[PDB]
């Protein structure tokens, strides 16, 4: 009975991720001193992860366990659209964090007058609008999923769509994240004190470390899938074994559950907020 225990393992992971992301959101919502434009981006990332883990992953696990779609064609389209939207929003909201930290490190003295709350929320809105355009846009212009059997839930088999989605949703934001974090790394390796003060320099070098951990885990989890799927859709004969191609799929979606572990195990204020929220 491989189905039941696999489903139980997956469900445990999804519930763990759901609680982790709710806890991350509450730790920032319920704390006055944690309300900063750079923490609202963490809350946005947690919101995308929470949507993915509470609305998308349960049905993905059921669909893996069963092996077919048991909820009709109408819910297939909605589930696929929400999945793609949340996945694109998560990575673009990580890219916006990369840009925010690059600005806060390169120009630590003008940062309060560059990244204002107005501009920070404008950036959030632009990220979400861009995610909607990149994700839900192509799903209509590239033959919204074709299957005609009411049990198949197959996003566009077209090679063009997978190229655009892979490029737009993984490889364009990854370039910005990696470039911006490298500059943060290079700057932090040359400057004695970032903002002339030791407390500020410490509090800026700690956040950069946490960002590096988040980015490293994200790349590690999501790179195998985006290396193995596009090649499969580009060279038809280079189809890998399904066992490894199932592992890379769930490895990528495990990030939405791991990230709330990254946040408190790297920072000391996030851990305290986690305790203060769990105790209540």
């Amino acid at each position, epitope marked *: 009975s491989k189905a039941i225990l696999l489903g139980v393992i997956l469900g445990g992971l999804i519930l763990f991720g759901v609680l982790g992301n709710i806890l991350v959101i509450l730790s920032v919502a319920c704390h006055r001193h944690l309300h900063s434009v750079t923490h609202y981006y963490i809350v946005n990332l947690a919101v995308a992860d929470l949507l993915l883990t509470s609305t998308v992953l349960p049905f993905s696990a059921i669909f893996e366990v069963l092996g077919y779609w048991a909820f009709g064609r109408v819910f297939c389209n909605i589930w696929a659209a929400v999945d793609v939207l949340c996945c694109t929003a998560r990575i673009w909201g990580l890219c916006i964090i990369s840009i925010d930290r690059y600005i806060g490190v390169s120009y630590p003295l003008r940062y309060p007058t560059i990244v204002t709350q107005r501009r920070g929320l404008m950036a959030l809105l632009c990220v979400w609008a861009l995610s909607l355009v990149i994700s839900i846009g192509p799903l209509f212009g590239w033959r919204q999923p074709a299957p005609e059997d009411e049990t198949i839930c197959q996003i566009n088999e077209e090679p063009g769509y997978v190229l655009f989605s892979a490029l737009g949703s993984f490889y364009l934001p990854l370039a910005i994240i990696l470039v911006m974090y490298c500059r943060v790394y290079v700057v932090a390796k040359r400057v004695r004190l970032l903002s002339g003060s*030791r407390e500020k320099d410490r509090n800026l*070098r700690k956040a950069a470390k946490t960002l590096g951990i988040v980015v490293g885990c994200f790349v590690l989890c999501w790179l195998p899938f985006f290396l193995v799927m596009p090649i499969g859709s580009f060279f038809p004969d280079f189809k890998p074994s399904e066992t490894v191609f199932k592992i890379v799929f769930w490895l990528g979606y495990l990030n939405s559950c791991i990230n709330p572990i990254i946040y408190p195990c790297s920072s000391q204020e996030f851990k305290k907020a986690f305790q203060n929220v769990l105790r209540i």
Partner: nanobody, 111 residues
Framework: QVQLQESGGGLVQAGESLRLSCAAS????????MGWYRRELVAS???????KYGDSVKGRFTISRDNAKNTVYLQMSSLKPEDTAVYYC???????????????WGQGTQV
């Protein structure tokens, strides 16, 4: 725990020169500002090469730093009867790229 200790001590009468040594030992990611103190500042070098001296030093001293082997030196010149109380070794070190800047002192020397 990074360690910096004095060196080059001894006994001599006025008119002769010395060369104290001080190098960093331990887990260091890099060193930023190094120099000697007498409490009072007598010299200091930054990682770039900007040399500084105290007002009491009328170009008397020459503090030198090697970027390769994490070592500093201080060449003495023209001892004075009332210019030797204690000589410390002060450095600011970082043990990692994502850690706070710290500093350490030395034991001391006298002549």
């Amino acid at each position: 725990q990074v360690q910096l200790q004095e060196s080059g001590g001894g006994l001599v009468q006025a008119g002769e020169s010395l060369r104290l040594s001080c190098a960093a030992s331990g887990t260091i990611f890099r060193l930023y500002d190094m120099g000697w103190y007498r409490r009072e500042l007598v010299a200091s070098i930054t990682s770039g090469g900007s040399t500084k001296y105290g007002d009491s030093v009328k170009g008397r001293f020459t503090i030198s730093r090697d970027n390769a082997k994490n070592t500093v030196y201080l060449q003495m010149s023209s001892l004075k009867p009332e210019d030797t109380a204690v000589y410390y070794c002060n450095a600011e070190y970082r043990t990692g790229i994502w850690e706070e800047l710290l500093d350490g002192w030395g034991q001391g020397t006298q002549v």
